[PDB]
Symmetry: D2
Subunit: 263 residues, 4 copies
């Protein structure tokens, strides 16, 4: 199966090149980038230490006609432009880009009538499984358990808490009939007093080169239940994106990552 | 508010059950049994736990069960089977946390369950029973290319390795992946082991200090790790589950277990 | 031959664990069990609620009990402790002070009493927490360039202050070793666009949940590795066992000491 | 001002991280990049894959790297390193030797070469692992009565030997401090009725899974608490950062040293 990778020289895109090689039902077809990046006219797998056999291109027109699926983990605005050409050639698209416009969301809904799209904020199999299970854990442990979300990332991370940590909070709040904006706590200083049963606490660590560590804690008199996900590199997201690409065998419509996983 | 009797009220596990009944909003302590010739007969049930329950520690099974909706029993098989017959007689429900019944004893509980409501379970922790359920889901989703390890920690006095819990976790994961536990389990690694076989379910056991019971199921692949963890802080884990089972079964007939109590059917 | 130990506040939560700690230690025996007069527990055996037959009755007679004792262990309040301290000086008995919240006048009275008796006065009696403070000094000095420092901490829901006295003291040891000021460089939570982390920052992440006795971790992180120094308390026995060890240690000594002296880390 | 550092085997996995380590240190500068005789990447920029512009073409000519360099870092095999050492001694240059598993003749060759030049020869280059070994000595001596010792270790699925060289070395430091023999008191697994654990046992729990670089924890446990000392490796940068630090440290020394000397732990 022929897969194209957008932003092929960027940090995420190089891992996607390795992910296509690792997966058997897949082989590498395209490699797009920005018009003007030094990337152009080099082997896609040269960064990772393979012989890709394909040149990094800046031809959205040419490349999409050969490839069956496109994967995009780039900046949001070029993605809508990439989406438009992908509709035309009857080609599937996996959208990894997050932090997206409200009018932009409607463009993907409309584009889903023409071809198959898997739209998700996080592409890890483990993180998506964690979201599902937190729903079950929250419902069973719904009286007398204190909920905390502990999270660790590298020193360069700008936003706290992560999109993942907040999404974990939304699943737990939604299952317990709470509002996250009303009952979240992001830090503790001084006499925080007795903890309110309704609170969902967020403890955030920013240090070193941590890829992304997330734990959801449920605590009561007698026990603690912890659901933890730990990312070792960006390969976690790439492996899930390639799996989502395999999953769309000509399918049409919009899918969450929960659909590929069967949840 | 539901009236609860505690068997073995002066024992370590009975004292935690007195606190568990107090802590729960829907329950109140109505009786506290101990054997005849206990040094604690006549004393308030909460004497060593800072509570004035207003209930004297008794050996009168007849009088105490007449004032009670549910009996919670973590004692021994012979006294439990004796309590079970008086529970059938009075129409009291019974939470059986006692272990080591034979096949005759188990049959007696099955027969008694036609007349009254029973929750009979090997483990009463809410979190451990929930963990068993989730591992089934986690194993099926992560069934290709994830290495499975069960890490476990207990106090120095623990005789069996791995724990009943750790082995039961292994059985749920093996059963979901179509593997056989006897043939693919590994309990240690020493020397030149070689590369790990994908099919192996490894067990790492820690025996140290005063650890009540720490269990983790690890799923690892290239790129990530998923850990499902349970940590027990004291005996309150089992008491709080038993009190929840008492609330659940009130006014029912039949035999149930923790899977029924937590709605995981 | 055995060391004779008296326990103040013997019916309180801390006093009950100290009765077990004195029993557990091979070369100590319980000699007395004090409580205030009009306690509900006067007359009863010291071990009544912990399953022991110690053979000593819970008393309110400070004079009579200290006459039969080598050491007193006191985790009560400052006014009763200062009253006990005066009787300890009079009867030539050592004292282990686990009590907090003294005045400067109370603190001066402990210094003066230490000319005449042996005293171990410490904020924390855990062996492992006191050891942790010491090694963080070494770890901070070696890992002084390019390591981000975070202090992660977890306690039960009823705990009032964040971060704990322990967590802040960990921060003070690390800041002191790196020539930083904790008031200037601490961060207690993160929300929104925090930006990139400043190299000087000492971050504090605090968890409040369930019945956690006290979990503390000091994290040192850089490109390539992570070093974690962690202490986990399972119960109050951590403090009791250290206090009993301080009692054994100070026997036959005079002067003022702390846990650093008991553990040989000075 | 900055120190001139040369890198051997710059296209190999370890050398790529070393190029990034040389940049990331503020007062070190890349001077050269040596490679084996007749490599497939001569002529290309040294930081060609590691993402920065070194301005240096990859060479396989010993001469350029030996000259106009203050220090050489070598993580190759026994054969090339002894040949590099001969040229390094001749040109008055320091060397950081990161190769492991020397021959007995090769170890003697390093000893006499250290009479003319500065050498840092060490089995592990991680700052955190070497610091862990030091601290375990202190922790074991303080926690020598009534604490159960366990060593928990986790590595990737491809790791052949259990436990790791690091895990066993941790065990040797703890055993040596407690006057125990590791061969006599180690336990590597538990199955069946293990019974109530012997106080003298040092247990080893080994995890083999996924892509774990190397996680090591030393646990000390008693009634009431737990002390954990943990080291976690994120990548090969762990070793590279220590090698560059060793290079800075040997900035005008002559002789044989190891990481204990670099970190001031004597």
């Amino acid at each position: 199966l022929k897969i194209a990778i957008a932003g092929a020289n960027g940090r995420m895109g190089r891992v996607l090149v390795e992910a296509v090689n690792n997966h058997p039902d897949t082989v590498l077809s395209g490699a797009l980038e920005h018009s003007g990046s030094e990337a152009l006219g080099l082997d896609a797998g040269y960064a990772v230490g393979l012989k890709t056999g394909i040149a990094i291109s800046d031809d959205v027109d040419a490349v999409l006609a050969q490839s069956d699926v496109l994967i995009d983990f780039t900046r949001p605005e070029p993605t809508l432009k990439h989406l438009q050409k992908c509709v035309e050639k009857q080609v599937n698209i996996i959208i990894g880009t997050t932090g997206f416009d409200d009018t932009g969301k409607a463009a993907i809904h409309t584009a889903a009538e023409k071809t198959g799209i898997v739209f998700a904020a996080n592409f890890s199999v483990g993180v998506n499984l964690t979201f599902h299970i937190l729903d079950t854990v929250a419902r069973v442990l719904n009286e007398g358990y204190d909920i905390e979300i502990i999270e660790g990332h590298h020193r360069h991370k700008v936003d706290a808490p992560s999109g993942t940590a907040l999404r974990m909070g939304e699943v737990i709040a939604g299952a317990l009939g709470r509002d996250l904006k009303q009952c979240a706590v992001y830090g503790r200083e001084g006499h925080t007093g007795p903890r309110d049963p309704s609170t969902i606490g967020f403890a955030t660590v920013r240090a070193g080169d941590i890829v992304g560590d997330h734990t959801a804690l449920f605590a009561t008199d007698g026990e603690r239940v912890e659901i933890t996900h730990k990312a070792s590199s960006r390969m976690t997201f790439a492996a899930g994106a390639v799996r989502a690409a395999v999953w769309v065998n000509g399918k049409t419509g919009l899918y969450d990552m929960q659909d590929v996983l069967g949840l």
